[PDB]
Structure 1
Amino acid sequence: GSVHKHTGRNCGRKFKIGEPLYRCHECGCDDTCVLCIHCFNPKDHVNHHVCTDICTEFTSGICDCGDEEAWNSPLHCKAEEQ
């Protein structure tokens, strides 16, 4: 796949229509904390309760990967893998 890292900052990517918004009960500060397809690392969340929402006109937002305020645990952004 293609990759564009956001090293040293937050992701903040606006979700595209049809795309999943990933949330994790264990890792997220709260239920508004979400991760995009570029960033969500399945390895961070193996035995966690992860849910996906789907981006629409009413359901939108920005990816919180790299926003320290959004996460209990250190995330390993999928984009950073090579």
Structure 2
Amino acid sequence: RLGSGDVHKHTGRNCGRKFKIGEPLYRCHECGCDDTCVLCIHCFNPKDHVNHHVCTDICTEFTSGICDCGDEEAWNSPLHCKAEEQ
């Protein structure tokens, strides 16, 4: 047996979650390679960002925008996905 983890765990791939209208998300000035790099609520790990300038958002329009957790091109440091924590 092996217990199941979080349904948002995505070890081995990019998260790719598509945001819905009204859904919040996170940005980090220091970690994001640019101001389009974002993390969904299931992925953002506060432990990765102590003393960083974090800025939340809410998706307010139909977008093809997606969570960049697990996309190393989007981040300046390793992230530790919150959904991987047990």
TM-score, reference length from structure 2:
0.86
Residue 45 of structure 2 contacts residue 81 of structure 2 at CA under 8 Å; is this kept in 1? Answer: yes
* Structure exhibiting the larger radius of gyration computed from Cα positions: 2
Aligned-residue sequence identity (percent) comes to 99
Question: Do residues 13 (structure 1) and 9 (structure 2) align?
Answer: no
In the TM superposition, what is the alpha-carbon distance from 1:37 to its structure 2 partner?
Answer: 0.5
Q: Which ranges of structure 2 fall in alignment gaps of 5 or more residues?
A: none
The verdict on how the C-alpha distance between 1:59 and 1:49 changes in structure 2, with shifts beyond 3 A counting, is: farther
Mark the runs of 5 or more structure 1 residues left unpaired by the alignment: none
CA RMSD of aligned residues (A): 1.8
Q: Structure 1 residue 50: deviation in Å? A: 0.5
**Residues paired across the two proteins, number:** 82
Q: Deviations over 1:29-77 (max 9, x none)?
A: 0000000001000110121001011112156610000001000000000
User: TM-score under structure 1 normalisation?
Assistant: 0.90
